[PDB]
Amino acid sequence: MNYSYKRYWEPSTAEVIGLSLSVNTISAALTYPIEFVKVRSQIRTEGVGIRSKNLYMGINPNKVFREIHATGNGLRGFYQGFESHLIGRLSYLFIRNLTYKIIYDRTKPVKAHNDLSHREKGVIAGFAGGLAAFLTSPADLVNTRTIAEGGKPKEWRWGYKGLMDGINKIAATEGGNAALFRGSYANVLRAVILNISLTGPFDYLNEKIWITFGDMTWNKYAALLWASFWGSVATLPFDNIRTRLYAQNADPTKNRLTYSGWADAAKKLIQHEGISGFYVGFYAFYIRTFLYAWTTVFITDKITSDWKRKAGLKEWQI
Amino acid sequence: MHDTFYVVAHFHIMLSGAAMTGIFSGIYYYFNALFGVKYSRMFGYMHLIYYSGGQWVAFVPLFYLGFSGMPRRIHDYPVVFMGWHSMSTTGHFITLVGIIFFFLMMFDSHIERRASTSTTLGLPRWYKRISYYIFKIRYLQHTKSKMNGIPGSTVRLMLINRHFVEYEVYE
Amino acid sequence: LNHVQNMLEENLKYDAQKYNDEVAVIQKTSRIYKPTYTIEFNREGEVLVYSADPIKNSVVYFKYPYVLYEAAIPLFIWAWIYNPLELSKNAVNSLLIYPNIAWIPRMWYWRSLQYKIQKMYLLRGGKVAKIETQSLAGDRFTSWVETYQFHPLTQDQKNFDNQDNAEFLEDEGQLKYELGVQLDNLQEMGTTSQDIVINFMKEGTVHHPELFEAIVKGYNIDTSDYVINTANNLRAREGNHNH
Amino acid sequence: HHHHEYDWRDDPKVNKDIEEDIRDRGWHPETYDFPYTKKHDDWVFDVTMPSQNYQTDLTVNIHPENKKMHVMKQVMRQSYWDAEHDMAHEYDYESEDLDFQCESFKSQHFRKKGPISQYLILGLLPILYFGTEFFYNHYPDEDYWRVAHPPPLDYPDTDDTDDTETFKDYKSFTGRRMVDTGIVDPLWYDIREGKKVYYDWAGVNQPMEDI
Amino acid sequence: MFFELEDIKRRHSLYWDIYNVQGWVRRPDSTLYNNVKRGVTAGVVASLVQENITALVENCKLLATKYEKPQNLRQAATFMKEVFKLENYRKAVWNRSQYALCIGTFDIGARLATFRWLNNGWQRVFAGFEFNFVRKIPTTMLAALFTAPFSVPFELARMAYYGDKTFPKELQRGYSSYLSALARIPFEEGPYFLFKNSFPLIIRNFFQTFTLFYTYDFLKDKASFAWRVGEQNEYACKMIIAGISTYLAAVFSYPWMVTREMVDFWPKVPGAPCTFNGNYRKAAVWIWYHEFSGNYFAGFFTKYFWKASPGMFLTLMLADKVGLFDQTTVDNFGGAGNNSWEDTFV
Amino acid sequence: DQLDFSHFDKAFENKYDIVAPEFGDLHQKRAEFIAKNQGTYRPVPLVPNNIKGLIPKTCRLPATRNWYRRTSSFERNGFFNIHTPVLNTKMIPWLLF
Numbered sequence A: 001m002n003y004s005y006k007r008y009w010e011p012s013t014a015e016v017i018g019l020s021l022s023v024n025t026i027s028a029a030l031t032y033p034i035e036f037v038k039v040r041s042q043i044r045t046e047g048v049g050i051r052s053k054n055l056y057m058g059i060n061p062n063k064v065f066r067e068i069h070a071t072g073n074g075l076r077g078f079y080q081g082f083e084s085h086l087i088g089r090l091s092y093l094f095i096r097n098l099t100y101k102i103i104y105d106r107t108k109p110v111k112a113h114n115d116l117s118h119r120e121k122g123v124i125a126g127f128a129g130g131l132a133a134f135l136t137s138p139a140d141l142v143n144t145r146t147i148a149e150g151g152k153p154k155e156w157r158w159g160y161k162g163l164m165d166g167i168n169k170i171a172a173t174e175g176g177n178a179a180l181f182r183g184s185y186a187n188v189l190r191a192v193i194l195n196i197s198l199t200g201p202f203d204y205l206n207e208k209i210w211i212t213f214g215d216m217t218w219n220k221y222a223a224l225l226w227a228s229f230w231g232s233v234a235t236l237p238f239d240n241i242r243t244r245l246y247a248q249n250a251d252p253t254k255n256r257l258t259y260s261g262w263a264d265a266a267k268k269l270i271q272h273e274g275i276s277g278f279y280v281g282f283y284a285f286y287i288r289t290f291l292y293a294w295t296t297v298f299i300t301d302k303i304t305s306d307w308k309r310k311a312g313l314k315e316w317q318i
Numbered sequence B: 001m002h003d004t005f006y007v008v009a010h011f012h013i014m015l016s017g018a019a020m021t022g023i024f025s026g027i028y029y030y031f032n033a034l035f036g037v038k039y040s041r042m043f044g045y046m047h048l049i050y051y052s053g054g055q056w057v058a059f060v061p062l063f064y065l066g067f068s069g070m071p072r073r074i075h076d077y078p079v080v081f082m083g084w085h086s087m088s089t090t091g092h093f094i095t096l097v098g099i100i101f102f103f104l105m106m107f108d109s110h111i112e113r114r115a116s117t118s119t120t121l122g123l124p125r126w127y128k129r130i131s132y133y134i135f136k137i138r139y140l141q142h143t144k145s146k147m148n149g150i151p152g153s154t155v156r157l158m159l160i161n162r163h164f165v166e167y168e169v170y171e
Numbered sequence C: 001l002n003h004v005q006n007m008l009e010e011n012l013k014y015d016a017q018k019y020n021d022e023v024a025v026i027q028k029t030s031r032i033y034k035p036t037y038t039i040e041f042n043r044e045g046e047v048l049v050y051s052a053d054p055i056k057n058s059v060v061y062f063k064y065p066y067v068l069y070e071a072a073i074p075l076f077i078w079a080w081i082y083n084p085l086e087l088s089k090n091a092v093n094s095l096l097i098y099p100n101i102a103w104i105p106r107m108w109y110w111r112s113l114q115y116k117i118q119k120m121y122l123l124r125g126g127k128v129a130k131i132e133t134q135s136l137a138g139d140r141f142t143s144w145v146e147t148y149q150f151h152p153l154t155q156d157q158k159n160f161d162n163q164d165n166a167e168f169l170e171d172e173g174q175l176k177y178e179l180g181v182q183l184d185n186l187q188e189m190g191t192t193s194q195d196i197v198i199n200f201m202k203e204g205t206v207h208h209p210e211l212f213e214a215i216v217k218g219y220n221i222d223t224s225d226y227v228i229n230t231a232n233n234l235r236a237r238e239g240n241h242n243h
Numbered sequence D: 001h002h003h004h005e006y007d008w009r010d011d012p013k014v015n016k017d018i019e020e021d022i023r024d025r026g027w028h029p030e031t032y033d034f035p036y037t038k039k040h041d042d043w044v045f046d047v048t049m050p051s052q053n054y055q056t057d058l059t060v061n062i063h064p065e066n067k068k069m070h071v072m073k074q075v076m077r078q079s080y081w082d083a084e085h086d087m088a089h090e091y092d093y094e095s096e097d098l099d100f101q102c103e104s105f106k107s108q109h110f111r112k113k114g115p116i117s118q119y120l121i122l123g124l125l126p127i128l129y130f131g132t133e134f135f136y137n138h139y140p141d142e143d144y145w146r147v148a149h150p151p152p153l154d155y156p157d158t159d160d161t162d163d164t165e166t167f168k169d170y171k172s173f174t175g176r177r178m179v180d181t182g183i184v185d186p187l188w189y190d191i192r193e194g195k196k197v198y199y200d201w202a203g204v205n206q207p208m209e210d211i
Numbered sequence E: 001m002f003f004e005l006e007d008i009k010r011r012h013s014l015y016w017d018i019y020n021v022q023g024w025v026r027r028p029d030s031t032l033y034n035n036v037k038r039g040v041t042a043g044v045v046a047s048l049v050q051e052n053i054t055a056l057v058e059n060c061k062l063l064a065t066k067y068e069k070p071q072n073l074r075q076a077a078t079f080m081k082e083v084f085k086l087e088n089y090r091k092a093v094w095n096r097s098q099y100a101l102c103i104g105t106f107d108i109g110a111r112l113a114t115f116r117w118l119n120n121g122w123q124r125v126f127a128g129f130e131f132n133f134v135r136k137i138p139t140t141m142l143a144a145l146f147t148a149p150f151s152v153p154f155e156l157a158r159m160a161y162y163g164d165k166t167f168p169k170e171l172q173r174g175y176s177s178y179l180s181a182l183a184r185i186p187f188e189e190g191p192y193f194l195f196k197n198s199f200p201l202i203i204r205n206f207f208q209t210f211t212l213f214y215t216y217d218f219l220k221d222k223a224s225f226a227w228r229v230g231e232q233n234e235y236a237c238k239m240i241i242a243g244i245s246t247y248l249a250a251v252f253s254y255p256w257m258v259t260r261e262m263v264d265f266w267p268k269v270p271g272a273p274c275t276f277n278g279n280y281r282k283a284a285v286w287i288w289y290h291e292f293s294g295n296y297f298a299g300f301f302t303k304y305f306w307k308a309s310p311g312m313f314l315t316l317m318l319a320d321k322v323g324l325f326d327q328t329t330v331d332n333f334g335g336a337g338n339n340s341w342e343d344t345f346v
Numbered sequence F: 001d002q003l004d005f006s007h008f009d010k011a012f013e014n015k016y017d018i019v020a021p022e023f024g025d026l027h028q029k030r031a032e033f034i035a036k037n038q039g040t041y042r043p044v045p046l047v048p049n050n051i052k053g054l055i056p057k058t059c060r061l062p063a064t065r066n067w068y069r070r071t072s073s074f075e076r077n078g079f080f081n082i083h084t085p086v087l088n089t090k091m092i093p094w095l096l097f
């Protein structure tokens, strides 16, 4: 199968930067309210967990969406953190893609049909995602607290009007720039797990479906659905703990639970919520992951196929 | 007709149709005794409709092929049998859809989790008119209990008659 | 879907709620009729107020609207057999559709013959009337209906006659014309049907006309002044000329 | 015996995150006793039949069509297993518990329904199994379930696929006459360059490339 | 390369099989533009006729509420003339024609286009029947799910447009026409105003689409022996098949509108919580588990059947006419359909 | 204090502040008007009062005026009868064919 890779045309650094930034901006704009609901769901069960039984386990994304819309802000009230989430997402993607492209070009195989194994690519992507998540941890922290201050009492709300405003408020109130990286390790772990739990399963199911069904058109989308499911399963506990560490106020009095780190957050989640507490908001997170991946892959495939056709690759090479 | 799809259709209408339909009837008759919960009427009806008709659609063309001289145990045959063979395969896939509906009805019944109430209400036989009276009284009470939360005939007729509320010009 | 505000929908909701709350099952009534004579009930606490033999006096076979269809059937049969119009196979098959539906009006007429009232009794208490009819196959049906369900119809049956002040009875008490009466809810054979039209033929005999009229007009009859007759002159499934 | 303390997180009235099953409005299986000994259905009147006496009340008429709405009575919810308690009730002590049946009827083993997701497999058993017998096992062979593609021009050899020759067989004199007979359908492909391109009306996919 | 997931494209060597004409082979005429055009045409025509019929029926109902129903054919003709002369009737015709354009361009046309895009390549059998019709079940389910919420904004826009004409002019939005209301609502009340608690509409659309398309295709293929073996008209057969599919779709779609009626029209019990908590979804679940099916089929023809059944029937007929149900049928023994021609005549 | 789940604590309250009406000030005003004027303000769709050739409807019409005998019926307790004697009479022809 290592003979079957198709890397005749590889985009330049400028091409990958521009395409990634544009398409990921489109995807984040399309699928941000889903992440808003997911963060909202993970906070209303910060110390309660799942208390319903059987088919009612979890928090209803439609119920959360209806409540947030009944707040009064309408659909426009789902982008408060998107003001700051977009910058953090784009910076994470820029750093990750730069590191990934450099490490890949310094290690990629000579033959166009030979590509690095999934394990090597996972190592590269995990390093890139960890570095980018550590560098974008302040932006992700500002974004989460903006969403978090809707389901919390008036005394517990930080009141961030943007990204630079949040950065300045954190650097002033909480001690300094060192306080900007609260939950940085949690974000690093979330990015590392997310960067290794998608390509593997996606290629797995895509190739197995092709073996079973040949060169149909639904193969890649079914594999994308499968990859989104498994990536959500692998990443959601880390994302949940990252949200808990981000929403933890500096004042211990203004916290439903007080965490001294990732380990403390996990311990308290297991103690009060249980094992099932890590997968609250699973439907919202999985739908967001699938829609984001579908939009990005579809638009990138269209643009890159057009570029390959312009460059002159044969139709079997595209 | 020996060693022919006429014989195949004979013993499949006897076994695949009749015997399996009786087995399904016994499963439904003892559904509470087997699983402890009431079964799902909707998916059960779907399974009944698709499984029973599928047998006809799958094994009447086999009768037609048996009358046409189609020997058994051949994977290739004269091309004057392809139409009824296709119809038989269609009937088989209808039967498969019925089986899918049966598994779906088991799944939905175990979703439902409702205690089953016998239709006899404890009086399987009306050997006496007093037994008939007791059953009638209990049946009327049970039906009244079921029909709670459902508006009366007048209210339902009012809602149905005045359902349409989309008019252009008023007074 | 409820977030869309419609004032007609709100009026419908208010009407349903007000009917649910204000209007109750127990409804007060002031339409009470006191007969001027002692009522002689039978063994079963009932008084026979109307008797007839409708099927005996009903045209069953040679009724005009249906003999036309049943005589037109052979025309279609012959048209299919010889194909005089040089039609196609599907066209002649369509020609044969008719003989399968021409007897349906006769079936409906025969069913309507079973709603002509053969006997009507008033029970003690003057609130329930028993009605005995029979399907033409000889299937006897007995139904009890509250007296307030009755609404007399006009002679032409085209409009609701006034519930009171209506004169469908002659001076001596017999029916002036074949009287149609609509029942809002008739529980026939164990199933309730809405707006059922029953008929009392003029050829029948109306015993105790007063009570009969009070049954038709919807009044509750006062049966305080009553006596009981000890006469078991009827057997179960007794034979009658109405067959 | 006994039970644990009170936790408002487990209380649907206090914890609004607990979604309510409206089909379990009046049924609380966690309070069920085995064997069931609680009466939950008795005589009900004043719904359509008044509980008072108006049989001979000439001033009162009964109109059941005006049935006032009441709280809907849901079908009885089946009991849900109390795992630990059940695992403590049917538990066996080896070589220290006598092999006997107790006198109390509460020793009866009652069937209480459990989780539902397991039956999800039972919901998809006719599908998955069939896939397992056709897709996972690739029965009968690999190429049956794949989307059909014709072989390319003269592949794998001109013996199995004499497409070029067939082209000539349709362009020669005799072949043309055969088409005029109407017993041979027209040519279904064209040889363009070293490739074979099927016509749109042929009804087949295009041959795959020799990658 | 671009984000967390890499859509790895792998080259594969050639494969082929004996037969070519009974799997998925995309039709040439099944392009995006062609499918959209044909589906939109059929949908707009069917919707226009359906909405005209609905307006006529409802205006006849109104005139019946105001005047006695006819007693004979001449009175019926006079009643129809008076209904036609109604200003309310003509305004309803115009507004429901605009709504018909909107719903046949973006809902019925979208359903037809998605169904064609998903079910065009399923080829039939040459001289038999498409035995593997199960392959079209997940495909038709996806087609129905994708186009299920397309009619929701237009349905809610119609409800809001007719929902303000019944208020005093001090509380009215204006809405000179349904198109104006559709253009104004998402900017005044918000886009979610057109997508709130629309589960009954979504599930009704899903059931209509799936039942109608699947049943019509299945009966058009399987019952073809009626006009291939039996020498019937095939057009009476097509009409009967379309009617059966439409009746099944209406039967399987009405209970969700019944759920809406139960939730927001059934009188409440004072001092008690709502039976379904005002969600409609549990209501469907309740109807899914209700013992007395007829208890949620009352008003089937009065409320819903005569407002969607003609539309579905005409959609089926026009889609068949324009060729959205035509499937490729090629002989498997001759030429393109086979890769082993030796074993076809010996 | 908190983390003692014997009694509910406002620290675990999960409710979003109602900043503005969900669907606008006009929607709120119409909701209030409904809350106050439900059942009193009853619009009537426009129909001409006098129309030539039509007999005005002043009372309910008898069942003898129907152009179609309906099949289903209603039991007064709110039940819906699909199976009626009319249904039996209507099923007599079809089953015969």
Ligand code: HEA
Pocket: B008, B012, B015, B016, B017, B020, B023, B024, B027, B058, B072, B073, B074, B075, B092, B095, B099
């Ligand atoms: C009882 C036995 C039985 C059953 C049920 C069937 C069911 C079916 N049979 Fe067969 N058949 C035989 C017994 C049976 N058969 C025998 C003995 C032979 C001869 C062998 C020989 O020729 O040498 C034969 C041969 C035979 C042939 C011969 C092939 C050939 O000779 O050319 C064909 C092909 O058409 C055929 C078709 C079918 C089909 C399409 C079904 C369909 O009905 C299949 C439908 C599926 C089911 C009926 C399974 C039900 C599903 C469940 C999961 C039930 C389990 C659930 C519970 C009830 C708890 N069968």
Ligand SMILES: CCCCCCCCCCCCCCCCCC(=O)OC[C@H](COP(=O)([O-])OCC[N+](C)(C)C)OC(=O)CCCCCCCCCCCCCCCCC
Pocket: A213, B093, B096, B097, B100, D126, D127, D128, D129, D130, D131, D132, D134, D135, D136, D144, D145, D146, D147, D148, E019, E022, E023, E024, E132, E134, E135, E138
């Ligand atoms: C290890 C754990 C278990 C792993 C299990 C993995 C498999 C799981 C089960 C399958 C999941 C669903 C996959 C559907 C993909 C369909 C894609 C497609 O276009 O397929 C075209 C195929 C073939 O279509 P066709 O009929 O055009 O092709 C026939 C072959 N040629 C090309 C030569 C003419 O159709 C299907 O696969 C239909 C699937 C319908 C849904 C049922 C899924 C299981 C199917 C099993 C085989 C078929 C049985 C049919 C009756 C079943 C009754 C129960």
Ligand SMILES: CCCCCCCCCCCCCCCCCC(=O)OC[C@H](COP(=O)([O-])OCC[N+](C)(C)C)OC(=O)CCCCCCCCCCCCCCCCC
Pocket: A030, A031, A033, A034, A037, A061, A062, A065, A072, A073, A074, A075, A076, A077, A283, A284, A287, E106, E149, E150, E151, E153, E186, E187, E188, E189, E190, E191, E192, E194, F022, F023, F024
């Ligand atoms: C699947 C959709 C099928 C649609 C088929 C029909 C298409 C044609 C008709 C479309 C009508 C609706 C769009 C109107 C667009 C023009 C109006 C407009 O945009 O106004 C500015 C609107 C105005 O919003 P607003 O809410 O401020 O409205 C103002 C009115 N108040 C404040 C009183 C409510 O601005 C926005 O919408 C800003 C956000 C951009 C769009 C975000 C889309 C999110 C989509 C859902 C994502 C997932 C959410 C979670 C789901 C559950 C959990 C998983």
